[PDB]
Design a protein around this nucleic acid. Sequence first.
RNA 1: GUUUUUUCACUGACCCGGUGAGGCGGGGGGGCGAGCCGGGCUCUCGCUUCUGGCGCCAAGCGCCCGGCCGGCCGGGCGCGAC
Lengths: 67, 118, 102, 225
Amino acid sequence: GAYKYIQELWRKKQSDVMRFLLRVRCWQYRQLSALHRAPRPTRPDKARRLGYKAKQGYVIYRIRVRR
Amino acid sequence: KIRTSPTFRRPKTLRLRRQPKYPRKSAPRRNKLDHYAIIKFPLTTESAMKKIEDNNTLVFIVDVKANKHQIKQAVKKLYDIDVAKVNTLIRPDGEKKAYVRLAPDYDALDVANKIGII
Amino acid sequence: GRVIRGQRKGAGSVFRAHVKHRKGAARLRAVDFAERHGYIKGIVKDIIHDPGRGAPLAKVVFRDPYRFKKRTELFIAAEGIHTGQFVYCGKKAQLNIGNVLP
Amino acid sequence: VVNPLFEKRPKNFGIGQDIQPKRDLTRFVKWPRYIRLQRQRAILYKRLKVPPAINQFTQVLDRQTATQLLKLAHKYRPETKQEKKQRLLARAEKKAAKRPPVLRAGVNTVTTLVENKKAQLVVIAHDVDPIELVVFLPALCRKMGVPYCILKGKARLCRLVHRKTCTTVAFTQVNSEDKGALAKLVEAIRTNYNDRYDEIRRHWGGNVLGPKSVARIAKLEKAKA
RNA sequence: GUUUUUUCACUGACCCGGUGAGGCGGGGGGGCGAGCCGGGCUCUCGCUUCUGGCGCCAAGCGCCCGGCCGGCCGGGCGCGAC
């Protein structure tokens, strides 16, 4: 099943693959506004767990909090 | 085809007009400032009855919202008469007083018998 | 426990500059192709007094190298500038007074 | 015959002498924040040392082979929404009065039949935006002996199915007549991905500077020789 | 090789300055200088400085393309403006 392969792939955030993807997206997300609508979940897999079904009426925003 | 200006201005996108699937309110709210509801009562004051006999006018008490145009039809529609001009002042009481100067083809003191003031 | 005068000066409202009759921001002309690779000619219109500046300014009206309009820049007036003097600005412009170059 | 008034009136676009013409400024436009953003994302992919699990979606099936796989994949359209209705009229003919092979779309219903070895071929799309959906799949097919191929476009792979986009497409069992073309597609795929995956694992993307920064190194090479 | 690590420039986040983000970087066509008996090259400039005018909405040279009776009544597209 596809989701379990993305599941453990998101647990190796220290990896060469995910030290690139979390670094070039963290670039990308700073250039967009502080609080805007994401067209989809960045993680389909993680949103599966938290109850997001990909039907009409479910909304996902991508907001930043100053650290 | 090349960008002639160095500023990307937003392109003029098509917009559609309001086609309502239901009207918001069921009917249009009726004209509550009628020609009866705009002129309350004519003043029968000695100063007013002087103004009617001396200056070819009538003195009405008018609803505070009224224009000089609305009165110019209000006195025309209800008394079959014409108006030279209207001079509206709001009294210290808080009500409007229209000095409806009648055109000289009609008589002011004679039409005061029609409205029933003496 | 009262704030000192310098701390109050930093805030604003009262210790701000009186920029009403100030005849504008004394700055150069913006760099473009007619500054970097060659020169451009613009005439000195009138030397003028800026209230809140010891030195006078100069309305130097250049022709716009791109648009039909005619641009006007508030320069710091060099000593020996006069009205109707041609002030040239850019790389290939000469080395004399007012004549700005890199 | 000729008109002597018709005069050549030329312009001298030398600096200051005459006004400039309406020439190309496309590459000096202040673009919207989203157009600037997506462009210098594509640039960071070309500068930053891209790890080879992401770079393997640049090694794509070429122009000549892509259309050949789509040709046979166009035989196996999963039925249209209105073709669905046309099966349940062939139903109450027998009641009142086996299935043909298709493609299997998505990452779930492909990767559940890569370990199972019920896929004779996998068709990966290269431009899945949250890449992690697919990153594992080129590696997965190498272990289970399923020939994986990567295509240029998730939309054009989503054309074969009746949707907007589709990430992956697999062949389970095919028509006994049309095994020939399906088997010849495998050899050009298997010997271009699966037989050399350990070469794909040592294949780094980006680390290429700007073309005026690359062209300044050439100046610092042509000065000492 | 692997890491600790001083030292040069690298850009790619990140910061700054200007702009109405208007010609940036390579390369070529085109002019000044250098070397071989029309020849193929190493590098330089690339158009406005004698005066309180004028300059925008292209002339020019190409090429297809609308009628009526190969001759008569126009629009569009390229260099010009690599």
